[model samples]
Target: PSEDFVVTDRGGIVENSHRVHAAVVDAKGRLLYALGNPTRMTLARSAAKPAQALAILETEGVAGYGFDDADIALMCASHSSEDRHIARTRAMLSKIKAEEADLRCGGHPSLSEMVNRSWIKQDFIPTAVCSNCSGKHVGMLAGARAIGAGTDGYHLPDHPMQGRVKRTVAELCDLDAGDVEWGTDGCNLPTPAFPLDRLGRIYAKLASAADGSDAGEGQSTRCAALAHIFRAMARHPEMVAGEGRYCTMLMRAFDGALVGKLGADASYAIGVRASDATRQLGTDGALGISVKIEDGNLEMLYAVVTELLERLGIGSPDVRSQLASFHHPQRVNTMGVTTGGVSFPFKLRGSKSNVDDPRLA
Candidate 1:
């Protein structure tokens, strides 16, 4: 059921090939679908921020730092570094009595094409707040300050603040702290590498946090944290990424039905709220989906995402149309002629289709 998918241009010429790995899990962390090696270990990168934000909230850092839910949204973002994002990040620093110099992440060309073009048109100088991850760094600084930990070396692996991040990542993924392998993310912060299935588990929990079915004595506290983070992201989708970006567009298109996050390289994750629509999978509830492109091709990554959502009937017609550009993307030549088309040829068949009114298992 899992195989190598193709992205081809005109004349059936292959543009690139990818071996995609995917996992679909429910709120209880049960696997509902698997493509390729679902258990494959990979880094979650910035997609881990929502869970990391949970760490900050669990530590009372949000209140301690006087951050509202919108601030929490920014904290969980891999932003486009647009004017609003930059302004919010600077505002967060001011709230914490911190400065741009306290940010551990360095600036790069913004993820927003508009901002990047503006930077090119005018001689734009990059600052720490211009980094796409500036909000995340600022949040971590607040967490560090809340715990009386020094913000000067907060990005260090051995820093107490990072210790909390590592613990939070593991707890949210249902893994032991020692099981997660750590590495430096592009933003120069500790990133986690765990079984890809754990990614689905965490996101499943995220999508279902408000359901309360999984919020018993054992995990009610964590579930509350997840719900808080999810609400913030849904309410302030713009801060998570930005305008004209896939993350922002996707979340806006779905209008909170689903929330997605993209990581550096080609890793993406989604959390889907439980509804009758999801009953097709024999699960009448929240679901988590994780996709990894082995070759690190973002075009293939996004193409497959839109294709899968369409096949699963995850959104309304308008939402699907909003995403059509990514779903049925085509290549253009210099003369503005269509040169090639990008597609996903993989079939997802795990959902039970025999019943007219499928119920949860």
Candidate 2:
């Protein structure tokens, strides 16, 4: 087991701590580094959106519906419900000739407090199209139409669209359909639970495909679709998330070197393209990383992720500094006093047992 990452007050007194489980895998599915139980079965939540969107890419829906890269990016988003996000989602629904009423995802409060305030000021009640996951549902509707399946009951686990999504997610994770556990997401979509490292494998495959690496046996078409997804998300980071969100900030800070997404709860996944930094990590190809915070603390999740990026020496100093606030977020009291901050007390375990291994050190 790994030591907990801790939060501390001004006098270095422990305030709180979180147990983190993480995995780093290469394109070849080798576990490069791990913290705690890397194989822990974890619910990916929205982190699995890329794999879910890939199912639509495999069908004729994307092209037939005139969905471009930005649209595809939205299909893989957990958006902040900003004006642009809502507008684009509505446009996508229109492209597919589907009404917002057809969407199974119900709207709730906007993820962005700013957006929520604006909604409150206008006395606006969000509709289905205002859902953060609306783009995904719209994409599913288009996918169903393209495949000649009924869009009704599309959110059901037994729906053909969901079945296809399940299969695609399993294949992306290098698992069989039966090996995954199923559950309902908050957005009313069927979600998958799998080994944490397998989630890493999915992102690794995405990066590898985007880098134009070999797709391995029987994955040519699938890898191509994965490449499209990687490009779309990277090209439109705002659509993937939104302003002031960790996903958007991380993607923008790293530029196109990596693609990242935050799942509901405290899960996150990132795919790093083959680069000099990755080469130093001993991977000649792309790398994937997945993280989970046992307590579901989003702040701690970002802190640990930023800490991992620093320890691995993944990005340039300036680029990494862009996320410095998240690396050690300050705890401010109601009176506006700087009470405490976060710190990493754990080190990632390397694949090798050598005591002198830098990763182990």
Candidate 3:
């Protein structure tokens, strides 16, 4: 068996094979599983949103500006540029007395092709409003208001809101934010880079609470907010994602039971809570998982997430069946290549022991 964490038994999305660095942390800040590349260096990309927003929330005295859960959740989103998302972004600017001209991120081919095409027909550069991260930017604006700080240089590291965000991330990751390598995000704010396991830690916190309450401290707001985002995503699946989009299908298939957010490059994270379950999903160490496919394949990323959930044995039989697509994924290419689906190489917990030095040769 291969050493790296096996998301699937077989079938991969990209032409090249992919690797997953996964971690399952329980509610009490314990590492349940350190799947491959747990400590791998990576750019958190949009994955940094919640942590960044949390950074601002804590440092800026969140309750002060009345940053509600929706604002909190939106702050962490890589939104699909839907109507509400756009409206909120505009509202965020109004709150800050800023304008579309002030946004730093630009729109391009949306993760949704139909949206991109629609914009093309209208002949508009996917402006900042169309950006998938526009919600996050708006959240930042609220953060500025929360602190009664200037919106000028809001995206910069030196800005007051940015400063708090930076510090929060540092504390959560248990690293010096100064040690984190900083880069501009597709949304025009600073993104952080660090070892992979911390992503797991973040997921651990999302999955369960420090004290293991079914309704944990951050879970309701964080989990529900994301749940609502995907709910909105499901209600407006087409709006959540353009036609022929993986994220849209994934959310639809999952049926609003969970929230899935994709970060820039190969990063993706999921917050899972069975809609009917009384005990919160992640509350039992049934966590939110973060995964990174070193090689960025939009296809492989979803395939991997599907398998990761199954290996952990979280979803219902129907959900499991739908997720099985990750493993024998069928491809219909121009040449009709029909690449066979991928299978996870490693066995998950309670099934087998940890892989030796997971991450791959």
Candidate 2 ranges with C-alpha deviation above 4 Å: 213-219, 353-355, 359-361
Single out the weakest 10-residue window by summed lDDT for candidate 1.
352-361
TM-score-based ranking? 2, 1, 3
What C-alpha lDDT values do all the predictions have? 0.80, 0.87, 0.59
Can you give the TM-score per candidate against the true fold?
0.93, 0.95, 0.76
Candidate 1 residue 202 C-alpha distance from true site, Å: 0.9
Error of 1 at 345 (Å): 1.6
> Which residues of candidate 1, in runs, are more than 4 Å off?
213-219, 349-361
Best by lDDT: 2
lDDT of 2 at 311: 81
Instruction: Return the TM-score for candidate 1, rounded to 2 decimals.
Output: 0.93
Per-residue lDDT, model 2, residue 275, is 93
Compared with the true structure, the alpha-carbon lDDT of candidate 3 equals 0.59
Top model by TM-score, which number?
Answer: 2
Q: What's the best-to-worst order under lDDT?
A: 2, 1, 3
